[PDB]
Amino acid sequence: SLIISERKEEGETVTWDLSLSEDSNENEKKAWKRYFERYGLTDEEISKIESIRVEGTEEEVEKMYYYYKLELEIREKLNSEETEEKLEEIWRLSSKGTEENLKEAKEIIKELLKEIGYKEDVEKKAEEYLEGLQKYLDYLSKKFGITREQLGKRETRSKLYRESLENPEKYPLFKLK
Numbered sequence: 001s002l003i004i005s006e007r008k009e010e011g012e013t014v015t016w017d018l019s020l021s022e023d024s025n026e027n028e029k030k031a032w033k034r035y036f037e038r039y040g041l042t043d044e045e046i047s048k049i050e051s052i053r054v055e056g057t058e059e060e061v062e063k064m065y066y067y068y069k070l071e072l073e074i075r076e077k078l079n080s081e082e083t084e085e086k087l088e089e090i091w092r093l094s095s096k097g098t099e100e101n102l103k104e105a106k107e108i109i110k111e112l113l114k115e116i117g118y119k120e121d122v123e124k125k126a127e128e129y130l131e132g133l134q135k136y137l138d139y140l141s142k143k144f145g146i147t148r149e150q151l152g153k154r155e156t157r158s159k160l161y162r163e164s165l166e167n168p169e170k171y172p173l174f175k176l177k
Helices: 026-037 058-077 081-096 099-115 122-144 148-152 154-166
Strands: 002-010 013-020 049-056 174-176
Touching (some): 002 058, 013 026, 013 058, 026 058, 049 122, 058 081, 058 099, 058 122, 081 099, 081 148, 099 122, 154 174
Antiparallel strands (some): 002 013
């Protein structure tokens, strides 16, 4: 499953390290890998990532945690290129940030959540997903000095991930093994 593997409480912000637990089944591990494989990293580079670090207030990072929990469950149970593409479009729409863009993203995430069994709870689970994605985009924009809308470009995410592998001091997005 997705766990919080480390917490740093420094001043006005908190940083949570998010990663997979040791008892993660093979479908969760494969999903973890595909979150990154689709964005320019080799298998050997991905195998070096122990966790993803998120930063903000306690309320902000908790929101990010629940977005990542749902992202992983979607990827695990609906593993498919069609799913990856819908998830990319939610990210694209959400980085643009307009009201109609987020309404369209909400409809996409709702169909995915229903497909994994969140039916009676789809509305609240969609809000949880989208709120946490929005805080996560806000965190990447502020932390690494990237226009939020630019984050919706595939080339921006590849660049960011690759810089975080290479220079994990100037780009502390990952904990490396």
